[PDB]
């Protein structure tokens, strides 16, 4: 029975959102593994199934509600519950397939999707790239609605994918990157919806390589650069962890800590 972090868009503020994400980062990581000031998520191979998941319960003004499940090892949405039905992305390996069986064990209808939660697949299903899908309280309230109505036969696949894209970013990506948390806080604060720019998209795409680059680094210095993009989409490169400290909040486990 996994811990449950609760958030509502109804009355949402920059502070309630922050406390939320903060509590989410705290449940993902014991905090035992910190390298170059950046906490590393628990390792997947050893992890006991009773410590593998975290539940996020979302609400909106409509008073609709879905519960997302996050993987403690990557912080990604792996599935969600709405009513008496639960839905999960196609897991890459077999080990992860097993683990999923321990989530929402009490509703009558379990389903596995015929697609992963990877952006390219989601973007295809939605008929829209991330840079064309607005983020913010508004969008979030709508995702929640659509995730819920999917379990009633109300929302079609395209809108579901879109909604996944919104939740994954405003939650998973924000947990991983403080820079992205900051992007969301700006919206809300000013009551905006806007699509994420290159600076955001490009980070969401390099979290994996970034983690490796830092963990395999030579006291911070990358073996080889990571390609990033500025707000205007101009290409650039990072070679050292010290410049990413304010940017990245969590790392996926790649290597063992260097003694």
């Amino acid at each position, epitope marked *: 029975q996994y811990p449950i972090i609760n958030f509502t868009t109804a009355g949402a503020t920059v502070q309630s959102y922050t406390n939320f994400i903060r509590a989410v980062r705290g449940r993902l990581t014991t905090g035992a593994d910190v390298r170059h000031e950046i906490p590393v998520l628990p390792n997947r191979v050893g992890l006991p199934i009773n410590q593998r998941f975290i539940l996020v319960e979302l609400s909106n003004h409509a008073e609709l509600s879905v519960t997302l499940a996050l993987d403690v090892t990557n912080a990604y949405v792996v599935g969600y519950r709405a009513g008496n039905s639960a839905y999960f992305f196609h897991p890459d390996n077999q080990e992860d397939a097993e683990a999923i069986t321990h989530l929402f064990t009490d509703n009558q209808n379990r389903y596995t999707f015929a697609f992963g939660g*990877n952006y*390219d697949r989601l973007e295809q299903l939605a008929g829209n790239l991330r840079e064309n899908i607005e983020l913010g309280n508004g969008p979030l309230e709508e995702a929640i609605s659509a995730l819920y109505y999917y379990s009633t036969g109300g929302t079609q696949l395209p809108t579901l994918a879109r909604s996944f894209i919104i939740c994954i970013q405003m939650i998973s990506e924000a947990a991983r990157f403080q820079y992205i948390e900051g992007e969301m806080r700006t919206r809300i604060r000013y009551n905006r919806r806007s699509a994420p720019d290159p600076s955001v998209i490009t980070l969401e795409n390099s979290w994996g390589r970034l983690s490796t680059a830092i963990q395999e680094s030579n006291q911070g210095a990358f073996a080889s*650069p990571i390609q990033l993009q500025r707000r205007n989409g101009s290409k650039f490169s990072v070679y050292d962890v010290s410049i990413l400290i304010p940017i990245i909040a969590l790392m996926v486990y790649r290597c063992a800590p260097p003694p």
Partner: nanobody, 117 residues
Framework: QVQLVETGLVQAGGSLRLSCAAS????????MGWYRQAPGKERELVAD???????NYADSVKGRFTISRDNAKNTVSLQMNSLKPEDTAVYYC??????????????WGQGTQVTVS
């Protein structure tokens, strides 16, 4: 279990096409692209493209190289026109994928030499 295969001497200002096919457990395969390295220098992103149609291009090759992707057969193409001696390098195909994050795996090709002038 994911493999990359690279098919494709040219004179200055000529054209050339490079391909990269993917196969095996590529269900959540995301972006695919081409890097290059001139000995002693460094790896440079050249181009990449997401199955969803997002294309990136190094400044150097804008208006010269065109990258195309065929989803049906999980393959990527690189059309290289107006070649310069500066383009001379070992070119590497690259693929990224993952269901739980964009780049859970980061696979590289063995590389194909390209010589100009």
């Amino acid at each position: 279990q994911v493999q990359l295969v690279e098919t494709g001497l040219v004179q200055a200002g000529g054209s050339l096409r490079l391909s990269c096919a993917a196969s095996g457990s590529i269900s959540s395969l995301n972006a695919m692209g081409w890097y290059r390295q001139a000995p002693g220098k460094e790896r440079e992103l050249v181009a990449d493209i997401s199955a969803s149609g997002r294309t990136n291009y190094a400044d150097s090759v804008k208006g010269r190289f065109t990258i195309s992707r065929d989803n049906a057969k999980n393959t990527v193409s690189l059309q290289m026109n107006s070649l310069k001696p500066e383009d001379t390098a070992v070119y590497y195909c690259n693929a990224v994928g993952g269901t739980y994050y964009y780049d859970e795996y980061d696979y590289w090709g063995q590389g194909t030499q390209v010589t100009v002038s």
